[PDB]
Design a protein around this ligand. Structure first.
Ligand SMILES: *[C@@H]1O[C@H](CO)[C@@H](O)[C@H](O)[C@H]1NC(C)=O
Ligand SMILES: [Zn+2]
Lengths: 188, 597
């Protein structure tokens, strides 16, 4: 299976427009993942990390995005915060593994890298695995926005600023979420 | 929705963009301060333009959310900070004139020269020329022409500007719901927080006056000891029961009496504890100094420095040709980036300033959890008080022995300890009446209680009665001697130097009691007390998110200024001073002048 084009991918997505790759019909080696010690987070939910290498599943999804170090805690079932609520939401019944690693050497530039964005405002919380890529003006009060920013009328996306001198909590982290589905289909 | 629902959303947009623009200004200003360059002056000014502009629009928007419509105090405290904006209310022509005055005062202060009557070829600036006189000269006449020339050359120029300054600054202040410009300045201590943590701007005057009354006995005895020792140097011009003449005080204004130490030292046959020589013999470098400061904060349970702190700070003057600014500063650049800029040298002084500056960084790190606008000291006095108690602990002989800069058998002589407390007092106690009296004058001028026809009359009445200091030459109303001090001519409030002095000993006593240190407060070292560190963090982590009264209570147990820790610190020197003074007058007459004859 080709975990190497997701993990070791050159370019990563902003958290709000997160990428998804389907992994099916695939010889699945999970030892290589938990053998690499570059990863700073490797929490698994449902399945056991070593015991993962001998389970077979109906399909595998690999969601990939970039966030701030302070927010890697939010990529977990039961979390709240701007990321968990408005950008990428995990179901309470999640089965899979969250894998994150510091990417300050790739994703931060002197003067700043403002290409990665996150959603700041939304009228309600995401459903598990929902992907909101819209850019309508957020209308915070009763008066209407008419597609332009103004009083109580905010553009809903916001850039991270990634300079290499930032503290760890403000440094870019690349995340891969592996979703394992087990029933209601044959194994692969 | 609610006004409060909209305010929260408004603040969320503010915070996210403010943290960007504030960070980029910090980074650009760091580049300038670590590489003085005409280009880095441009990048610095543009980053401050973007940040100033944004910050100004956002203050206007914040006013659309009426505070009375807002329940949550944390939202309320952030909006409150945003909508204290300034002279925006002032008309454009008046606003343009105020700025004209402000810059003109600052520029004639920073460029005025004073010429020697004896040698017209000798015309000195305050720095370095006049400062060198006022801090080193023991010649009554030299000090006098420096002191009078400055107050006559630059002070007379400042006089009509300062009259217009008061009128305009007052106009702005009243158009902002404040009584006067002084009431506006006292704004920094206002607290409308929970329960009985509230604090009115008028309470500040009452509390500064009640506490000063408790400090004056100690001061009066310091004043009489110093007067007696100055008789031995200026016998012709010192009256044993009068005020001290203002030009003999060890700096241009008498703001500190630190430079009177060679004249007044109790036991000049004893040397100061100075571990500088030990540091050179143990081959310390700048890295070792900051490593040891770091060990100190870890010993009390506080975080290490970040990896970026070590990688990005400038702990040493560069030798790559980069011109830098050497004054020591602690930087909270935002987004987890903490740095110190210092041209560190292997001396006891720089060893102590490193603990001071790292104390600032520890406060910064603790309140990074707060929203952007609450990321600050509880009030304007807290940050320095925190940095200062780190110096107090690091300098104690107990700590220097544990660090290894003092031999394990070292014993401090009662005489050496009196020498040390006396030097402390010349700086710390000596400035308290000066600082209170200066700001009390300004407060009364802004209030309109001192008419312009009595400005210099009342300045010297209060300097005589409060400070025990008398002018060597009469000064009519052509003079403006208050404006002849940097902070007055450059529009900075002054009471912070009073309040932080009181806080700093309250902090130190409460931590020392937590560490269960027995013995005199001035010998206490909080090292290795994780209990003391926790109590400290209880306050630091709050930032400006609570009333300063509650932040104060978290660390010291009471919610107001109390001078007993300050008096307890100096009680050894106090009982020594009373003995010394027993055959002299204590206090001073407000009538004797050096020019009365
Ligand atoms: C890319 O990452 C994968 C992890 O799936 C690793 O096995 C591989 O060695 C990496 N690429 C290279 C060239 O090493
Ligand atoms: Zn400081």
């Amino acid at each position: 299976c080709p975990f190497g084009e997701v993990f070791n991918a050159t370019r990563f997505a902003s958290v709000y427009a997160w990428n998804r790759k389907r992994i099916s019909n695939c010889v699945a080696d999970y030892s290589v993942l938990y053998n690499s010690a570059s990863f700073s987070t490797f929490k698994c939910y449902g399945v056991s990390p070593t015991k993962l290498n001998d389970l077979c599943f109906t399909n595998v999804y690999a969601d990939s995005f970039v966030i701030r170090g302070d927010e890697v805690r939010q990529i977990a079932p039961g979390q709240t915060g701007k990321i968990a609520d408005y950008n990428y939401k995990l179901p309470d019944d999640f089965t899979g593994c969250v894998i994150a690693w510091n990417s300050n050497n790739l994703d931060s530039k002197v003067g700043g890298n403002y290409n990665y964005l996150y959603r700041l405002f939304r009228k309600s919380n995401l459903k598990p695995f929902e992907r909101d890529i819209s850019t309508e003006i957020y209308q915070a009060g009763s008066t209407p926005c008419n597609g332009v920013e103004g009083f109580n009328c905010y553009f809903p996306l916001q850039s991270y600023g990634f300079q290499p001198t930032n503290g760890v909590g403000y440094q870019p982290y690349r995340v891969v979420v592996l979703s394992f589905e087990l029933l209601h289909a044959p194994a692969t | 929705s609610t006004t409060e629902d909209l305010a929260k959303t408004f603040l969320e947009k503010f915070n996210s963009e403010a943290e960007e623009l504030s960070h980029q200004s910090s980074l650009a200003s760091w580049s300038y301060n670590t590489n003085i360059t005409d280009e880095n002056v441009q990048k610095m000014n543009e980053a401050g333009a973007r940040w100033s502009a944004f910050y100004e629009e956002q203050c206007k928007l914040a006013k659309t959310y009426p505070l009375e419509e807002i329940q949550n105090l944390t939202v309320k405290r952030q909006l409150q900070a945003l909508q204290q904006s300034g002279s925006s209310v002032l008309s454009a022509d008046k606003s343009k004139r105020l700025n004209e005055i402000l810059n003109t005062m600052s520029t004639i202060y920073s460029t005025g020269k004073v010429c020697n009557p004896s040698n017209p070829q000798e015309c000195l600036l305050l720095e370095p020329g006049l400062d060198a006189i006022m801090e080193n000269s023991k010649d009554y006449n030299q000090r006098l022409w420096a002191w009078e020339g400055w107050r006559s050359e630059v002070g007379k120029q400042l006089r009509p500007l300062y009259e217009e300054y008061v009128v305009l600054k007052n106009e702005m202040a009243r158009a902002n719901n404040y009584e006067d410009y002084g009431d506006y300045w006292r704004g920094d201590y206002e607290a409308e927080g929970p329960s009985g943590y509230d604090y009115s701007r008028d309470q500040l005057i009452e509390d500064v006056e009640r506490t000063f009354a408790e400090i004056k006995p100690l001061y009066e005895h310091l004043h009489a000891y110093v007067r007696a020792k100055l008789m031995d140097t200026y016998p012709s011009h010192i009256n044993p029961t009068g005020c001290l003449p203002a030009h003999l005080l060890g700096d241009m204004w008498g703001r500190f009496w630190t430079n009177l130490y060679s004249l007044t030292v109790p036991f000049g046959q004893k040397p100061n504890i100075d571990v500088t020589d030990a540091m050179v013999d143990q081959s310390w470098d700048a890295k070792r100094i900051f490593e040891e400061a770091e060990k100190f904060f870890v010993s009390v349970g506080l975080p290490n420095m970040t990896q970026g702190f070590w990688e990005n700070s400038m702990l040493t003057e560069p030798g790559d040709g980069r011109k830098v600014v050497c004054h020591p500063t602690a930087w909270d650049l935002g987004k987890g980036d903490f740095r110190i800029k210092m041209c560190t040298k292997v001396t006891m002084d720089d060893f102590l300033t490193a603990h001071h500056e790292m104390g600032h960084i520890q406060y910064d790190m603790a309140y990074a959890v707060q929203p952007y606008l609450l990321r600050n000291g509880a009030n304007e006095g807290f940050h320095e008080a925190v940095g200062e108690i780190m110096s107090l602990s690091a300098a104690t002989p107990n700590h220097l022995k544990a660090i290894g800069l003092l031999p394990p058998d070292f014993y401090e002589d009662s005489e050496t300890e009196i020498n040390f407390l006396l030097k402390q007092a010349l700086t710390i106690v000596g400035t308290l009446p000066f600082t209170y009296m200066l700001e009390k004058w300004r407060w009364m001028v802004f209030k309109g209680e001192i008419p312009k026809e009595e400005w210099m009359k009342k300045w010297w009445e209060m300097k005589r009665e409060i400070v025990g200091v008398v002018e060597p030459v009469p000064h009519d109303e052509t003079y403006c001697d208050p404006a002849a001090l940097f902070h007055v001519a450059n529009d900075y409030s002054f009471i912070r130097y009073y309040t932080r002095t009181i806080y700093q000993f309250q902090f130190q006593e409460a931590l020392c009691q937590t560490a269960k240190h027995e013995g005199p407060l001035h010998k206490c070292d909080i090292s290795n007390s994780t209990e003391a560190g926790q109590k400290l963090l209880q306050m630091l982590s709050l930032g400006k998110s609570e009333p300063w009264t509650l932040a104060l209570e978290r660390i010291v147990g009471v919610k107001n200024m109390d001078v007993r820790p300050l008096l307890n610190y100096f009680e050894p020197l106090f009982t020594w001073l009373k003995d010394q003074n027993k055959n002299s007058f204590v206090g001073w007459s407000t009538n004797w002048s050096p020019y009365a004859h």
